[PDB]
Design a protein around this nucleic acid. Sequence first.
DNA 1: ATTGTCATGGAATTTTGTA
DNA 2: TACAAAATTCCATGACA
DNA 3: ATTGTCATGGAATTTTGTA
DNA 4: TACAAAATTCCATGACA
Lengths: 365, 365, 163, 163
Amino acid sequence: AELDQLLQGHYIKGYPKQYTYFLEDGKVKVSRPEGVKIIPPQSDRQKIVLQAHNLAHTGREATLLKIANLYWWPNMRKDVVKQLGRCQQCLITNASNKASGPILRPDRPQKPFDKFFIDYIGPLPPSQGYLYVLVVVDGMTGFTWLYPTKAPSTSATVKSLNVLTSIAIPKVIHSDQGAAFTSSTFAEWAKERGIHLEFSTPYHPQSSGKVERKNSDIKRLLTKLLVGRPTKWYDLLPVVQLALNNTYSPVLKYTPHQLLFGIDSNTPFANQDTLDLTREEELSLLQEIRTSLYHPSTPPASSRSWSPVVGQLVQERVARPASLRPRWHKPSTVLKVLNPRTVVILDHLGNNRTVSIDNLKPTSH
Amino acid sequence: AELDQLLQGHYIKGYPKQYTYFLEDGKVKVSRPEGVKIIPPQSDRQKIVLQAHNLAHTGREATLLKIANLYWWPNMRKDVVKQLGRCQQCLITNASNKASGPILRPDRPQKPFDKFFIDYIGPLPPSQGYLYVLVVVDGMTGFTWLYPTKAPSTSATVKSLNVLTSIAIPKVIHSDQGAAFTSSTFAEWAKERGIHLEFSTPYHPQSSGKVERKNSDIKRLLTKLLVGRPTKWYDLLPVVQLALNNTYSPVLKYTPHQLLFGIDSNTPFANQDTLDLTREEELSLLQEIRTSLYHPSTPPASSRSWSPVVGQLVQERVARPASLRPRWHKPSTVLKVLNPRTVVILDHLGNNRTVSIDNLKPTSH
Amino acid sequence: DRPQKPFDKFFIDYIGPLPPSQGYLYVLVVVDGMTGFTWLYPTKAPSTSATVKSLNVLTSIAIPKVIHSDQGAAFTSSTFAEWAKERGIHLEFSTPYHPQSSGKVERKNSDIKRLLTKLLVGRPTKWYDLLPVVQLALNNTYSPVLKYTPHQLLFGIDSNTPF
Amino acid sequence: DRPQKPFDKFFIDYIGPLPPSQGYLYVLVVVDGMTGFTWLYPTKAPSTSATVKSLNVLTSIAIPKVIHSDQGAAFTSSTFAEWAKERGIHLEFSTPYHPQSSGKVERKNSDIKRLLTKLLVGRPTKWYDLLPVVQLALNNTYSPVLKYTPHQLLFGIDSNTPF
DNA sequence: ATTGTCATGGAATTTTGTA
DNA sequence: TACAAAATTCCATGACA
DNA sequence: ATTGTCATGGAATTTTGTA
DNA sequence: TACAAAATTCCATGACA
Ligand SMILES: Cc1nnc(C(=O)NC(C)(C)c2nc(C(=O)NCc3ccc(F)cc3)c(O)c(=O)n2C)o1
Ligand SMILES: Cc1nnc(C(=O)NC(C)(C)c2nc(C(=O)NCc3ccc(F)cc3)c(O)c(=O)n2C)o1
Ligand SMILES: [Mn+2]
Ligand SMILES: [Mn+2]
Ligand SMILES: [Mn+2]
Ligand SMILES: [Mn+2]
Ligand SMILES: [Mn+2]
Ligand SMILES: [Mn+2]
Ligand SMILES: [N+]
Ligand SMILES: [N+]
Ligand SMILES: [Zn+2]
Ligand SMILES: [Zn+2]
């Protein structure tokens, strides 16, 4: 082939002179620092790299190290990497070595009832025939409503929320994509009332994080109230609700209740500071506090993170991976970038999916 | 009580003068920057702090903030913290805010067969009536043996290992405290052969980490070999075994097989570098390589870590916490400190337990 | 004195009996003394028992310093009397047949009764499912004094359902 | 030439039939040409089939360049012939009735036969469970040349079971 | 009575073929 | 005594029930 | 089509009562 | 223009299926 010229002492791009290139057993051999290696004809080299790789479906360095034993040619790795990009198997099974970008800290809703966050807790031990708790948190104040249910169902969610909205109607309800909230029956209940439904990306509880974080505090306090006793939580819910709604956030120096009403009710240790102000004076002082609330900023990027660029080869993690089956879906493309942490992708194949980076890896190579 | 003196203008330790201390409704009140607060008599103050705390079993700041509303006395927090230490409930339910110390990187075994690490994988999909894989890794070389089993049982473990030890006998076998290896039947099998059994602390797979990390690589390669096909792994095991034993660790620049034998067998891409050395020359070159192997050091301490001191109040995490029940056991004491990461504790109550810090929190207060 | 505030006083009374809806018969009416904010709770009887169950709900949100009521059997009972002492609520009673309560409350209390009969007729059997809508309407309705909805006085912001 | 190495050549042969143990009848004997390291595999018949199953085990550890054997039906068959080509093993055959193999191997191959009859008698029925102990003994036994156990030559370290 | 490990692929650092 | 670009080494990230 | 949150308890930093 | 020690604020760690 093109190796012909080389044995005859003539130069080629790559193939550095100073090494003697000889012939043995009808193969083109070369003396190198590392030792004497064989140089395959261009047309054999893909076939070689593949054979080596397919032994254990090894990465760049592991593959090259096998090939190094027998062969040499110019730009060995460039070729190896060309293969690692085409191994359908390695791409959908290997995990990522790139962390996703810094999280986002969306702003506090401005007014109470601007946005509700909901979620179901459970199943729990049966009390009084009930198994789940519906937790509703006001995004602004952190004020929380609890409702015992027998199942995490659309029907029961509606029953509960009808009671709640007797007090006021929210602009927006944010939920996970759990069966209870995605149903058409709910969607309409919500439209009937002029409430916008909003859902977090699939398999990302962190988005419903404001409720989730209240779940923690609920389960924790119930646990504490039930040490010793049999797990009879039903009758405790009210107490928990109250207790938690009147608990100071050390960062804010305010109980949710305070942020919702601007005065403490007839609770234990009710703060009197505003006892002298008319309701009006008080009410605007409250309106001030609400705006001047502490708000976190996003954290520094981890040193090896990635951000999603439009038209990027990107892969979605498998829902519920089966035993011994690939942890990732085939490659798919970034359609739009909703924010540095949420992406729309044309998937398998193909529907627009809204997804969180945390469920994505960049296709490598 | 002792508050008598104060209303009369005489000084007391704490109780700073400059504020006017008056009487209203038979209570001792005080004008302060924050406002006008009540000062309880010493004997009432524990009862006060407890009432406040018991509302939501809140921490230091949350508790104090309630009390601040109504009362004032000197060193308020000192008292609050005294309570947080005695609330049996908060201690066994709250999580830690202190990370455990930097991990340890024990040294490579010196010789092959110095130490075997074992573990069971499974259950898997049934192939040929088998459900689990017994994975044995040589600590020194990383060389691995695989054995299909129908159950993760003592009896089957013995059967498998009898085959393995036909080749050579190890000094030590390290395992998790899984039923199969803790049994008396195994313990004797092992003593019969003069093999020391050694077990990692309870619920800390990281200790069996050398095998665990091989499990990853096994499941990964099997997954890759089974994309498309039905999960027929039984007949694949041999291939995997070979493939993995002849895979270069990029850090070491050596396949396990090489570290075990000092020469490559009749494998694809078998390295020829030592083809000219007598067995002897080769054998000592190998003996050199083994000692000069790359060995990691422990990582920097995380900024808020803790280390176990002898006679420290320390608590063990619950095995399999029930729903709504405390995530931690009652306080217990550090008996001896085996290493900066392993502790012996007098538990509940009381037996000597060997435990990893990762399953411990320091009792706070 | 000290100016009046929400949760200072809760006025309670029973409306009923009504035509059965979902097997309910009575409405327990709770108006907040200062704001005029209203809660409505359907009950099966004007009994201490049903009062307690209902007020347990409301008192998960807030606890008044005072409850005012007529001397109806339900509120005079010793069980209700104990219920309130437990929660640290002082109880206040109008004298028999001379029902003294706030100017603002009498009016709101009248509105409820009208608004109930109004949308009761035509569907006298399905007033249960309507209670949310009613409560919402009442609480978001401009008082001639203040030009504020009870909603506004309680929360110090605008509702997303005006009238 | 190039000095001799482990895995260069594997000598294989069948010992049997023996008194049945655990329903096994034959022992397939594999000695490594250079080290003298020995594997023993119990089989139910001196058949290509049982040879393949056995050698599949051994070849999970290492693959020889060459296998040498007598012209027994099991090794001459075309199935064995294909098995070896697949794994890239060249096959080598002694001529009939003149069994040429290594000086070192003949001796080791003799030792096995003696050591088998020795501890066979007295428990002729329970030789299966003993095969590990035998293999271990053989491989950790000092050769008069080298003063090295086959174990030492293979692994370049000392075993924790000397003899 | 004991204890984390290490393939992976971009980045970052060093060595290389030529002056 | 110096360059661009290949070849190597570094190392955070993730997952082994 | 959307997005993490925040109680907790030592450490670290600021304010306080007295000169 | 100053100190020791209380009172406050900072913030990593962990957990909400
Ligand atoms: C579509 C679609 N199909 N399935 C899902 C899905 O998300 N499923 C899981 C099992 C993960 C889930 N989890 C939680 C939850 O709270 N988990 C714990 C947690 C909370 C916070 C935090 F930061 C991390 C973890 C739910 O509430 C929940 O409803 N689901 C369904 O979405
Ligand atoms: C006593 C006693 N009772 N129960 C345990 C116990 O440890 N149980 C678990 C379920 C945790 C377990 N896990 C693994 C495993 O490999 N887990 C995954 C992993 C591997 C490495 C790493 F760093 C983190 C996680 C096992 O092999 C195993 O046998 N077990 C029993 O000990
Ligand atoms: Mn949910
Ligand atoms: Mn949840
Ligand atoms: Mn295990
Ligand atoms: Mn394991
Ligand atoms: Mn009445
Ligand atoms: Mn024969
Ligand atoms: N936002
Ligand atoms: N060690
Ligand atoms: Zn591959
Ligand atoms: Zn507590």
